[PDB]
Ligand binder design. Structure first.
Ligand SMILES: [Mg+2]
Length: 308
């Protein structure tokens, strides 16, 4: 009976550093490293899962964790990593959006093309876990990325957003249209070059995605991969997220200036108050130029406006 355990980042680092001569070439999908230890083979995965196989498996496992669970699991590929393992090193276009949940502002979709020779460079900019990066880091990293790799962006401003919405087009359909159009722009811009893969950070079922594009004049379908948390699959997606956020911030600064009031992000109470201030100082119609009207925030702001 081989043994498996769950190791945190500290444990993973200790394991890798401990065993001198750790192997990292030609390993199963998801595996970080393997140890050709005598009487026991150790394989550590991205998920933190570490497997001990061999005669002295239980013994080796005990050296790191107490009460190591035994299982029949083998050092095989991890389904969660099958995609990253194959797409990670390819030249690819990655796309993602921002602003969907923000009462104020547009929806921004960006796509970045990272050719094989630029993968390391973009990754060195610390694009991984872009979710952890604050706005100031975005303003710092985005420009570097835009300067290194080709990209495209499609900004859905509030007046157009509101028009599509009141017409019956839900956000899901809006996003599908924006991704497709942004992808079309990047594909033509990098031609004659062609990406080995096109990865869309999943926001809805593939089947539903293309159905929404049935009326589009041009549809990017070819080597399109719809994957969840795509940022962990390819640096191009992470790059897209950062660019999208950078543009969103830039749009918000411009929008706040046009409105004459600082527009907070999100859709909390502070947004309700801000919307109330806008109505009183500029008129309710001003919201049509800077907010996603159908949001519940509109009703709340109008109430606060008359309440004062
Ligand atoms: Mg997304």
């Amino acid at each position: 009976s081989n043994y498996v355990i769950q190791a945190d980042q500290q444990l993973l680092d200790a394991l890798r550093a401990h065993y001198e001569g750790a192997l990292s070439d030609r390993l199963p999908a998801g595996a970080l490293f393997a140890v050709k230890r005598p009487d026991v083979v150790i394989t550590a995965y991205r998920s933190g899962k570490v497997l001990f196989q061999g005669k002295a498996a239980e013994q080796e496992a005990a050296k790191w964790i107490s009460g190591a669970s035994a299982s029949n699991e083998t050092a095989d590929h991890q389904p969660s990593a099958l995609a990253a393992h194959q797409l990670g090193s390819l030249s690819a276009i990655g796309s993602d959006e921002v602003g969907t949940g923000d009462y104020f502002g547009p929806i921004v979709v960006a796509a970045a093309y990272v050719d094989r020779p630029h993968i390391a460079k973009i990754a060195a900019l610390g694009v991984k876990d872009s979710k952890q990066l604050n706005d100031e880091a975005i303003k710092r990293i985005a420009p570097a990325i835009m300067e290194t790799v080709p990209h495209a962006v499609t900004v859905l401003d509030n007046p157009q957003y509101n028009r599509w919405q009141r017409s019956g087009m839900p956000q899901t359909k809006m996003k599908a249209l924006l991704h497709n159009r942004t992808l079309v722009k990047l594909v033509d811009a990098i031609a004659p070059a062609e990406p080995e893969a096109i990865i869309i950070d999943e926001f809805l079922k593939r089947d539903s995605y293309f159905r929404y594009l049935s009326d589009e004049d041009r549809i990017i379908r070819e080597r399109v991969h719809c994957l969840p948390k795509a940022e962990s699959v390819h640096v191009s997606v992470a790059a897209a997220s950062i660019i999208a956020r950078y543009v969103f911030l830039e749009e918000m600064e411009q929008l706040s200036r046009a409105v004459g009031l600082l527009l907070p992000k999100g859709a909390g109470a502070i947004v309700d108050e801000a919307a109330a201030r806008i109505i009183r100082a500029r008129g309710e119609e001003m919201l049509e130029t800077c907010a996603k009207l159908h949001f519940a925030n509109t009703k709340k702001a109008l109430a606060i406006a008359k309440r004062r």
